[PDB]
């Protein structure tokens, strides 16, 4: 377990296991003080005598540290100078049991070091977005709205009616970068809000007054009302200074919110 | 709302916009505040809302600015009762309203310029009150003269009158003239400008005319800032101004040149900001800085009479500044001159938190005053009255005596009446000797002199130093100190060209004989090189100076 | 006049008897050679001027005889008739001492206890309790046998030591030395001292001049210092005089602690210390009333070092009338806290939150400086003392690894128990007043000697520290400050140590570079061996100009600094990964901020140096309006001392019965809002901890925490303050009050109310409340990952 | 704790010892109060 590995030429294995004639597997349970997001397990065999390297390694992980669960079938490890077992899906692990198979051609198993690499939930050690967020839909909508300008109008008209679309785009606008830069979200909100006056007023209410949704219904409770960023400021300015039939009404709404606030 | 609160600033920006739409509302505003009892909140609100052409015109026509200025002057010399606590709020109020060029002209007008002297007299009060008033006054003057030639002239005149240098006045001079001018730049673009922005919340409450969103930006940059730096702060992109319609601006113009053009193009002087558009003549002189205006009135000579970088170098700079026209030669390197001026005022920082010695091109500072003085002397010939005037004042202040003392200390000679560290010190001293010899030669024979000049140069270390240096029989040794030997030969030629200084060459082991021997050595070396077959520019120097010195000595001997 | 006062002080001086007295003692007392006793600390260099103990000092070890517990008599014949100033009766007790013995020590003359009743007429020094002489070590001490009768005389004496291991048997070791009055040119000097000791009018007039109630209050600061010197001698010699000081105590405290410098307070502290050490009314109540009566004037105190001694004395005497100190401090603290909150500037708040910097760089006026009740105090009145290495032992040297740069001696070969020395040349005779050497574990002991001309010419031993391995050397406000120029530090390596290289922090030294004519006077010391004001003012003006320039730099750099509120995910990322430009802005701000703090210290030192010179010249240094006009730094210092006083009050605790009419819900809220939000970390911490100890057990306490949480962390709050630091305090406060059932109840009610919209939600407010509630509950393994 | 030996000459060695005891006792009380 020592953080500093032994010398690469350390002539004696730091740890050795003598196999009884009827024993095929030896086990090493590493209990951690608290659960961590385990991502990789590194095992360093004694490089001077690789005949004592385990033939295979079966990794079991316990999130609670009590009920071990094999990650997969044992990995063939004979002939490897370094054993790097990467978990494709990081697993919460408070204990790790390594079951090392007797070497093919040796009665003793020699190991140098075991590393359990990973992360903690918080602290200094806590170091495809589209797949884990809803941003892909917004990127699709932005592509439809902006890729072909001549169709923008139609696209916006098809997109404006859907309930809670503007609230959702505003929520994605104010969230930390999640695979879509804020300017594209701003473009979506502005182009949707400009296709008719009613949704311009709704968007103004969302940005200034009430951004909450209008167990399956969208809620969007997570964000404070009226919060401003460079994004909201740009959206509001383009709405105000855009020349169209609704311009007057939008300005009216703005002034209304001003008076209400005062 | 309480004063200075950002929300109050935003509400006041809304009021400013409404006043700009309905100027008459502004009149109503002033009616609602009593335009007497003006609180600091009233002043803040009026200053914010008054930032419009119509609004500023009505504010001026209300008489409130005049009443405030007169009341402040009356307070300083001790129609509204003004106390010391309201002075700083009133100075800030005047500063904010002076953002407009019209109010900037008014504050710099005849009726108000007495208030400037009143404040300066008042400061040259409780300690906290005095500090607040000092800060407000410095800010007020900086705003008044900011890119405003008329107010720069007025403040320079007031300061010159004040002097006819420690405490508040030194700080004021350092902050106002010894710091680079900063102008607010207003950038418009047809496309958003994202560079320089942070995703976090930032409340930049500027004047609404500076816009909002990603297509508008407002920067506060030194007038020395190049346009390329401005663009790099926001992002091929080209900067345009409405006045210079349809003509791309070079990216290296710098804001001083742009201001020169805009004032040439009738932009009102003291306009709050430079409004450029981001779309997609270098010889023009930069606009005169407050330091340049102040010096153009002969202020730098006045400063010198009231005054690692060697201390002796600083003393020499302080002494040379008293000469007529030395300041004009000095200001050809604006940044280095500013650094030196800060140095002589007991300030080591270059105004941006960086120690001057650790600043860029600090190695030219130690010898810069002498180079400037040599340039000054070289352009003033004996025949013109100015040459005699300059030489006489140089002798009077003690420039020649100090030069000779430095020569004695640096060449290690005396008046006639680790390893690498020592080597580099010797090399620096050799450069000092070279520059001093060139300075003396220019002072003698610029590119007439007091008859007592020979007495000084004879009682000086000059003769021992020249005699020791001329006793060199190795031409290769001369090749290793080409600048020093070139300066020595120039001095010998200048002396031999002045019959009243020639006696310094003939025996008092004369210098001229040593020069002749060095000429013989160089000719023999050249003959040896021919037989074998930076001395290139040095091998004619020795010949020419030897020929001239020998001719002068022979002419003198025939004269005898 | 200055001459009469100077004459009196010279009269009060002392010398040690050059020839040793003879002593006869019971057989159980066995003498020890002075060389043996002083083996650890030899006096052979002092032997030249008869300073060593072998020429004048006698020593006896106690033999546990049959009657060793009973009377002991040291019969002491002087070498010659002389004006005896006092007899020093030193004693060292066994370390394993269960109880302090009841032994009376008295001085008699050769031809109450039975022996003393018979020898009643021969008594020269009344019965002195043995315990009165104890040292801090617990097993040590000394009695300075003296009295008016001893001064009023001029061949043999008796020291009678009788115990009323038992009694004197616990007295392991005793030693006696005799000190005479210095020989003075004053005529009939014996008659002059007799006059001072008898006449009361002398004492009353001394008090008046100290209080500046005489000669039109034109008494110079040096004159007041001399008066205290005379007063110290009177109290030591005597033990009615107490009545004069006690009747005028308020004015004495006022002038000496609120209108004088650190030295006067230290001297006044010494004078008051002696008075306490003395059938009269209890002195504690009288001193407390004076200190409490002047407490309201603390905002107007002149120097921090002066206030330090004031609060030190009050802390000792607070045990009487606990309510008065508590109520006075509470009233003043509440009064001063309001102004402190009102004086916070938006720029100061930004620095506290974004950077954790709690000084006032824009407020030029400091009140106190410390280096480190465990640190040197009042260091604004003294100058940092620069020095240059001139000579060293072996291959040792110094390296740098206005204030002097931190310097340490690097020694190439330390060995074990090996002595090395370094000689420091200040470049001039400097009035040395304060010294601080960081603890050095590489050496066992450290000796400091000082000399102006040469070590063997006028060499003086400043100090020897034997616990320098476990404590730093701290010399605070030397009352007879040396006038040395050269400083030899001799360090003895640790025993059982072979560290090749040694790094001994040299430390810090303070004092003055302009000795006043009377300060340098070699006649005013024991056992000897105006233009500047103009120059100092010129320097002070320069520092004012530069410090204002530095302060302006800080404002310009900060005016472009913006603090995102912690109310959104984007703001959370800003705090998680500071962007490079944000990092650079903090670096520039920190560099610029350091410049302001450095210049602020220099400006106060320059002001303090100029004031010292203007104080050498005849001059004087200067209720709610006082707080109005006080400096910010003075208020913070006053609160710290008051908070510490209240904290010691609670620790030393009927004091809880009082402080309930005050420190109610609003006052607790007022105190917390004013001090914990905007105060310094120590003030913040102490205010929070103080609030817990006082009101943590009140029913409304939990509501106060929730209300504070609501008011400070709701998203409608625009107040800028260190939420994280204040939140850590709140988490700490709740943990220390979590025994009060109302804490968690109210916190969950806030969480209940905040979540009511589900059954608008304020997510940032909920986050703060949940984290606070989570940390508090876990204090009340699968979740150890959190 | 490690007083300067020059205080023994006068009558102020006990006074200085008592002041330091005052300062040290107060410091201990603050530390103890803060560490409840």
Radius of gyration of chain D (CA): 13
Q: Which among C276, C465, C689 has CB closest to D34? A: C689
Contact B181, B223 (CB under 8 A): yes
Distance CA C595, CA C584 (A): 17
Closest by CA to B94, choosing from B74, B114, B108, B81, is: B108
Indicate the SS3 state at residue C674.
Answer: helix
Please name every residue paired with A118 in a beta bridge, in sequence order, or none if there are none: A38
Distance CA A214, CA C380 (A): 66
- Provide the 10 A C-beta neighbour count for residue C428: 10
Distance CA C563, CA B252 (A): 34
Sorted by sequence, the CB contacts under 8 Å of residue A72 that are 6+ apart come out as A59
Distance CA A221, CA A212 (A): 6
Copy the structure tokens of residue B223: 């007038």
- Quick one: DSSP state of residue C354? I
Distance CA C458, CA C453 (A): 6
Strand ranges of the sheet holding C408-411, from the earlier edge strand across to the other edge: C397-399, C408-411, C502-505
Place of tokens 């009827």: A22
CB contact under 8 A, C763 and A222: yes
| A121 and C CB contact within 8 Å | yes
Closest by CA to A190, choosing from A158, A233, A251, is: A233
Q: Distance, in angstroms, between C13 CA and closest chain D CA? A: 8
CB contact under 8 A, C479 and D12: yes
Copy the structure tokens of residue C538: 């010129």
Can you say how many angstroms the Cα of residue C321 is from the centroid of all Cα atoms in its chain?
Answer: 24
CB contact under 8 A, A174 and C785: no
Distance CA B432, CA A187 (A): 66
Q: Distance, in angstroms, between C272 CA and closest chain D CA? A: 9
Mutate to test the interface with A, among C562, C564, C567, C568 (most CBs of A within 10 A): C568
Interface of A with C in 213-232 (CB under 8 A): 221-225, 227, 229
Structure resolution in Å? 3.0
Sorted by sequence, the CB contacts under 8 Å of residue B189 that are 6+ apart come out as B215, B216, B217, B234, B277, B278, B279
Interface of C with D in 177-196 (CB under 8 A): 179
Q: How many CA atoms lie within 13 A of B476 on its CB side?
A: 1
Sorted by sequence, the CB contacts under 8 Å of residue C74 that are 6+ apart come out as C23, C24, C25, C29, C60, C158, C159, C161, C174, C176
Closest by CA to C61, choosing from C85, C27, C20, is: C27
Residue B211 phi, psi dihedral angles, 5° rounding: 70, -170
Copy the structure tokens of residue C194: 């007799």
Distance CA C30, CA C757 (A): 90
Distance CA C190, CA A70 (A): 102
Q: Distance, in angstroms, between C35 CA and closest chain B CA? A: 51
Residue B112 phi, psi dihedral angles, 5° rounding: -105, -25
CB contact under 8 A, C346 and B4: yes
CB contact under 8 A, C562 and B167: no
Mutate to test the interface with A, among B15, B214, B217 (most CBs of A within 10 A): B214
Residue A115 phi, psi dihedral angles, 5° rounding: -110, 135
* Chain C residues with CB-CB distance to B347 below 8 A: 546, 549
Q: Distance, in angstroms, between C784 CA and closest chain A CA? A: 6
Angle (nearest 5°) at CA A110 between A106 and A111 = 150
| A206 and C CB contact within 8 Å | no
SS3 content of chain C, % helix, strand, coil (to 5): 45, 15, 35
What is the DSSP track for chain A?
A: --SSPPPTT-SS-SEEEEPPTT--EEEEEEEEEEEEEEEEEEEEE-SS-GGGS-SEEEEEEESSSSS-EE-SSPEE-TT-S-EEEEEEEEEEEEEEEEEEEPPTT-SEEEEEEEEEEEE-SSSGGG--HHHHSSHHHHHHHHHHHHSSGGGHHHHHHHHTTSTTHHHHHHHHHTS--SSS-HHHHHHHHHHHHTS-HHHHHHHHIIIII--S----S---TTS-TT---HHHHHHHHHHHH--STTHHHHHHHHHHHHHHH-
Distance CA C527, CA C161 (A): 31
* Chain A residues with CB-CB distance to C781 below 8 A: 34
| A176 and C CB contact within 8 Å | yes
Please name every residue paired with A115 in a beta bridge, in sequence order, or none if there are none: A42
Q: b/e string for C280-305 if b means 16 or more Cβ within 10 A? A: eeebeebbbbbbbebbbbbbbbbbbb
Copy the structure tokens of residue C513: 């570079």
Cβ-count burial of B406 within 10 angstroms (0-12 exposed, 13-18 middle, 19+ buried)?
buried
Closest by CA to B431, choosing from B380, B494, B363, B359, is: B363
Chains that touch C (3 or more CB pairs under 8 A): A, B, D
Sorted by sequence, the CB contacts under 8 Å of residue C430 that are 6+ apart come out as C385, C483, C484, C485, C511, C512, C513, C515
Mutate to test the interface with C, among B129, B352, B353 (most CBs of C within 10 A): B353
Chains that touch A (3 or more CB pairs under 8 A): B, C
Q: Which among A64, A120, A175 has CB closest to C782? A: A64
Q: Which among B138, B174, B200 has CB closest to C564? A: B200
Cβ-count burial of A150 within 10 angstroms (0-12 exposed, 13-18 middle, 19+ buried)?
exposed
Helices (H) and strands (E) in chain B, counts: 28, 4
CB contact under 8 A, A228 and B14: no
Residue C646 phi, psi dihedral angles, 5° rounding: -65, -40
| C155 and B CB contact within 8 Å | no
Strand ranges of the sheet holding C72-77, from the earlier edge strand across to the other edge: C22-24, C72-77, C156-163, C103-108, C123-129
| D5 and C CB contact within 8 Å | yes
Copy the structure tokens of residue C623: 């209720």
Sorted by sequence, the CB contacts under 8 Å of residue C533 that are 6+ apart come out as C610, C613, C614, C617
Distance CA B315, CA C119 (A): 83
What is the DSSP track for C227-272?
A: HHHHHHHHHHHH--HHHHHHHTHHHHHHHHHHSS-HHHHHHHHHHH
SS3 per-residue string spanning B239-305: EEECCCCCCCCCCCCHHHHHHHHHHHCCCCCCCCEEEEEEECCCCCCCCCCHHHHHHHCCHHHHHHC
Contact C677, C719 (CB under 8 A): yes
| C278 and A CB contact within 8 Å | no
* Chain B residues with CB-CB distance to A228 below 8 A: 201
* Chain A residues with CB-CB distance to B14 below 8 A: 258
H-helix or E-strand spanning residue C86: strand C84-92
Region of residue B192 (phi > 0: left; psi between -120 and 50: alpha; otherwise: beta): beta
Strand ranges of the sheet holding C486-493, from the earlier edge strand across to the other edge: C388-392, C419-425, C486-493, C443-451, C460-465
* Chain B residues with CB-CB distance to C365 below 8 A: 127
Distance CA C73, CA C23 (A): 10
Radius of gyration of chain A (CA): 30
Q: Hey, CA dihedral for B234, B237, B238, B240, is it positive or negative?
A: negative
What is the DSSP track for D20-34?
A: HHHHHHHHHHHHHHH
According to DSSP H, which parts of B78-167 are helical? 84-98, 101-107, 113-123, 127-145, 149-163
| D35 and C CB contact within 8 Å | no
Distance CA B382, CA B445 (A): 8
- The coordinates were experimentally obtained by cryo-EM
């Amino acid at each position: 377990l020592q953080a500093t590995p032994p010398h690469r030429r350390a002539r004696s294995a730091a740890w050795s296991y003598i196999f009884l004639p009827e024993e095929a597997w030896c086990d090493l349970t590493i209990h951690l003080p608290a659960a961590v997001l385990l991502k990789e397990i590194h095992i360093q065999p004694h490089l001077a005598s690789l005949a004592t390297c385990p033939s295979s390694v079966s990794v079991e992980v316990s999130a609670d540290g009590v009920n071990m669960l094999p990650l997969s079938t044992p990995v063939v490890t004979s002939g490897l100078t370094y054993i790097k077992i990467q978990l494709v899906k990081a697993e919460v692990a408070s204990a790790v049991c390594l079951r090392l198979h007797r070497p093919r051609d040796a009665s003793t198993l020699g190991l140098s070091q075991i590393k359990l690499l990973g992360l903690t939930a918080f602290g200094t050690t806590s170091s495809d977005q589209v797949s884990k967020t809803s941003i892909g839909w917004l990127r699709l909508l932005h592509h439809c709205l902006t890729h072909i300008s001549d169709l923008e109008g139609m696209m916006a008209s098809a997109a404006a009616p859907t309930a809670n679309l503007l609230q959702t785009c505003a929520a994605l606008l104010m969230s930390p970068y999640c695979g879509m830069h804020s300017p594209n979200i701003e473009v979506v909100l502005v182009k949707i809000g400009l296709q008719s006056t009613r949704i311009g007023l709704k968007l103004i209410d969302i940005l200034l007054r009430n951004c909450a949704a209008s167990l399956n219904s969208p809620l969007l409770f997570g964000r404070l009302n009226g919060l401003s960023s460079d994004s909201t400021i740009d959206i509001l300015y383009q709405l105000g200074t855009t020349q169209d039939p609704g311009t007057k009404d939008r300005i009216q709404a703005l002034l209304k919110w001003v008076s209400d606030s005062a | 709302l309480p004063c200075n609160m950002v929300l109050k600033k935003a509400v006041d920006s809304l009021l400013c916009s409404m006043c700009h739409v309905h100027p008459n509302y502004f009149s109503l505003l002033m009616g609602w505040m009593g335009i007497l009892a003006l609180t600091e909140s009233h002043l803040a609100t009026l200053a914010s809302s008054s930032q419009s052409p119509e609004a500023i015109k009505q504010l001026l026509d209300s008489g409130l600015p005049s009443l405030l200025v007169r009341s402040l002057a009356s307070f300083c010399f001790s129609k509204m009762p003004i106390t010391a606590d309201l002075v700083a709020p009133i100075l800030r109020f005047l500063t904010e309203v002076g953002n407009s060029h019209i109010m900037k002209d008014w504050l710099g007008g005849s009726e108000v310029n007495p208030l400037w002297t009143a404040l300066l007299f008042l400061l040259c009060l409780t300690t906290q009150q005095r500090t607040a008033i000092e800060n407000a006054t410095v800010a007020f003057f900086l705003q008044c003269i900011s890119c405003h030639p008329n107010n720069q002239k007025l403040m320079a005149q007031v300061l010159c009158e004040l002097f006819q240098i420690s405490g508040f006045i030194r700080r004021l001079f350092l902050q106002l003239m010894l710091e680079d001018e900063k102008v607010t730049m207003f950038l418009q673009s047809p496309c958003p400008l994202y560079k320089g922005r942070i995703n976090a919340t930032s409340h930049v409450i500027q004047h609404p005319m500076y816009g909002a969103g990603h297509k508008f930006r407002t920067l506060h940059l030194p007038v020395s800032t190049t346009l390329s730096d401005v663009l790099d702060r926001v992002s091929v992109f080209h900067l345009f101004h409405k006045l210079l319609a349809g003509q791309p601006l070079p990216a290296e113009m710098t804001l001083a040149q742009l201001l020169t053009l805009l004032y040439d193009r009738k932009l009102p002087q003291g306009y709050r900001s430079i409004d450029l558009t981001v779309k997609l003549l270098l010889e023009t002189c930069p606009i005169q800085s407050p330091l340049q205006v102040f010096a153009g009135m002969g202020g730098l000579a006045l400063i010198a009479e009231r005054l690692p970088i060697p201390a002796h170098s600083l003393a020499a700079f302080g002494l040379f500044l008293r000469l007529p026209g030395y300041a004009e030669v000095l200001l050809k390197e604006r940044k280095h001159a500013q650094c030196l001026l800060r140095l002589v005022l007991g300030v080591t920082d270059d105004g941006e938190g960086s120690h001057i010695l650790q600043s860029p091109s600090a190695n030219v500072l130690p010898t810069l005053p002498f180079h400037v003085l040599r340039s000054l002397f070289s352009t003033t010939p004996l025949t013109t009255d100015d040459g005699v005037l300059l030489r006489r004042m140089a002798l009077e202040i003690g420039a020649l005596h100090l030069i000779l003392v430095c020569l004695s200390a640096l060449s290690h000679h005396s008046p006639r009446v680790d390893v690498e560290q020592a080597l580099t010190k010797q090399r620096l001293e050799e450069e000092h000797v070279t520059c001093l010899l060139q300075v003396l030669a220019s002072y003698i024979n610029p590119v007439a002199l007091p008859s007592v000049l020979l007495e000084l140069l004879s009682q000086s270390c000059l003769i021992p130093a020249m005699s020791s240096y001329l006793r060199n029989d190795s031409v290769l040794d001369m090749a290793r100190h080409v600048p020093l030997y070139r300066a020595l030969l120039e001095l010998l030629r200048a002396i031999a060209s002045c019959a009243a200084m020639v006696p310094l060459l003939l025996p008092l082991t004369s210098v001229g004989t040593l020069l002749a021997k060095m000429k013989t050595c160089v000719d023999t070396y050249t003959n040896r090189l021919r037989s074998k077959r930076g001395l290139t520019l040095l091998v004619p120097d020795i010949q020419k100076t030897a020929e001239i010195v020998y001719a002068a000595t022979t002419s003198l001997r025939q004269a005898n | 006049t200055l001459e009469i006062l100077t004459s009196l002080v010279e009269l009060t001086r002392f010398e040690t008897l050059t020839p040793r007295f003879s002593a006869t003692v019971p057989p159980c007392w066995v003498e020890v050679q002075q060389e043996q006793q002083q083996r650890r600390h030899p006096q052979h260099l002092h032997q030249q001027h008869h300073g060593d103990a072998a020429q004048h000092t006698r020593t006896w070890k106690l033999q546990t005889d049959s009657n060793s517990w009973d009377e002991h008599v040291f019969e002491l014949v002087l070498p010659k008739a002389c004006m005896v100033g006092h007899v020093d009766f030193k004693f060292v007790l066994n370390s394993n001492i269960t109880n302090i013995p009841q032994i009376q020590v008295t001085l008699l003359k050769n031809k109450l206890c039975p022996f003393l009743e018979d020898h009643k007429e021969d008594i020269l020094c009344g019965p002195v309790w043995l315990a009165s002489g104890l040292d801090l070590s617990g097993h040590a001490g000394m009695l300075t046998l003296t009295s008016p009768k001893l001064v009023k005389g001029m061949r043999s004496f008796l020291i009678h030591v009788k115990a009323v291991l038992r009694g004197c048997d616990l007295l392991q070791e005793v030693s006696v030395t005799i000190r005479r009055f210095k020989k003075t040119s004053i005529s009939k000097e014996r008659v002059q001292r007799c006059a001072m000791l008898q006449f009361s009018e002398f004492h009353e007039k001394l008090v008046n001049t100290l209080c500046r109630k005489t000669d039109d209050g034109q008494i110079t600061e040096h004159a007041q210092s001399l008066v205290l010197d005379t007063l110290c001698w009177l109290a030591g010699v005597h033990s009615n005089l107490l009545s004069k000081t006690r009747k005028f105590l308020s004015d004495i405290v006022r002038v000496c602690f609120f209108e004088a410098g650190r030295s006067i307070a230290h001297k006044c502290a010494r004078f008051l210390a002696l008075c306490i050490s003395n059938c009269q009314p209890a002195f504690g109540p009288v001193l407390l009333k004076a200190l409490l009566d002047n407490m309201s004037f603390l905002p107007a105190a002149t120097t921090g070092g002066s206030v330090y001694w004031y609060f030190v004395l009050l802390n000792y005497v607070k045990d009487e009338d606990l309510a008065g100190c508590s109520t006075a401090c509470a009233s003043l603290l509440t009064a001063v806290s309001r102004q402190l909150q009102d004086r916070l500037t938006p720029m100061e708040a930004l620095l506290q939150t974004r950077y954790g910097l709690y000084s006032s760089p824009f407020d030029p006026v400091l009140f106190d400086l410390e280096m480190s009740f465990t640190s040197l105090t009042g260091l604004l009145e003294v100058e940092p003392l620069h020095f240059t290495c001139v000579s060293t032992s072996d291959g040792t040297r110094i390296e740098r690894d206005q204030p002097p740069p931190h310097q340490s001696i690097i020694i190439e070969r330390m060995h074990s128990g090996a002595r090395r020395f370094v000689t420091l040349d200040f470049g001039r005779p400097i009035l040395l007043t304060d010294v601080l050497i960081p603890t050095c574990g590489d050496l066992a002991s450290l000796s400091i000697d000082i000399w102006t001309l040469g070590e063997e010419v006028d060499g003086r031993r400043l100090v020897v520290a034997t616990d320098i391995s476990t404590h730093s050397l701290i010399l605070h406000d030397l009352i007879p400050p040396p006038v040395c120029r050269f400083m030899k530090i001799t360090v003895i390596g640790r025993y059982g140590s072979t560290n090749a290289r040694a790094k001994i922090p040299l430390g810090f030294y303070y004092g003055h570079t302009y000795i006043l004519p009377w300060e340098s006077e070699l006649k005013l010391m024991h056992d000897p061996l105006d233009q500047h004001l103009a120059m100092m003012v010129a320097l002070q003006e320069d520092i004012q100009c530069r410090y204002n320039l530095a302060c302006h730099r800080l404002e310009t750099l900060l005016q472009s600094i913006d603090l995102p509120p912690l109310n959104s995910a984007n703001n959370a990322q800003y705090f998680l990964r500071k962007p490079d430009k944000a990092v650079e802005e903090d670096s520039r701000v920190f560099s610029a901020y350091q410049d302001c703090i450095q210049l602020q210290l220099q400006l106060n030192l320059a002001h303090n140096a100029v004031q010292r010179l203007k104080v050498a010249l005849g001059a004087s240094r200067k209720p709610e309006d006082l707080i109005q006009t006080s400096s910010t730094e003075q208020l913070r210092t006053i609160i710290r001392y008051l908070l510490d006083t209240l904290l010691s009050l609670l620790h030393a605790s009927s004091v809880p019965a009082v402080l309930q009419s005050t420190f109610h819900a609003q006052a607790c809220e007022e105190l917390f809002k004013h001090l914990c939000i905007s105060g310094t970390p120590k003030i913040r911490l102490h205010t929070g901890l103080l609030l817990v100890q006082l009101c943590g057990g009140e029913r409304w306490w939990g509501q106060f925490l929730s209300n504070v949480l609501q008011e400070l962390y709701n998203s409608e709050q625009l107040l800028i303050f260190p939420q994280d630091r204040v939140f850590m305090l709140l988490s700490c406060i709740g943990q220390r009050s979590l025994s009060n059932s109302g804490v968690l109840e109210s916190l969950l009610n806030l969480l209940d109310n905040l979540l009511s919209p589900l059954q608008v939600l304020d997510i940032p407010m909920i986050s703060w409340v949940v984290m606070l509630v989570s940390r508090l509950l876990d204090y009340v393994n699968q979740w150890s990952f959190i | 704790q490690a007083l300067d030996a020059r205080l023994e000459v006068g009558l102020e060695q006990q006074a200085e010892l008592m002041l330091k005891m005052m300062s040290t006792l107060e410091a201990d009380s603050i530390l103890q109060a803060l560490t409840n």
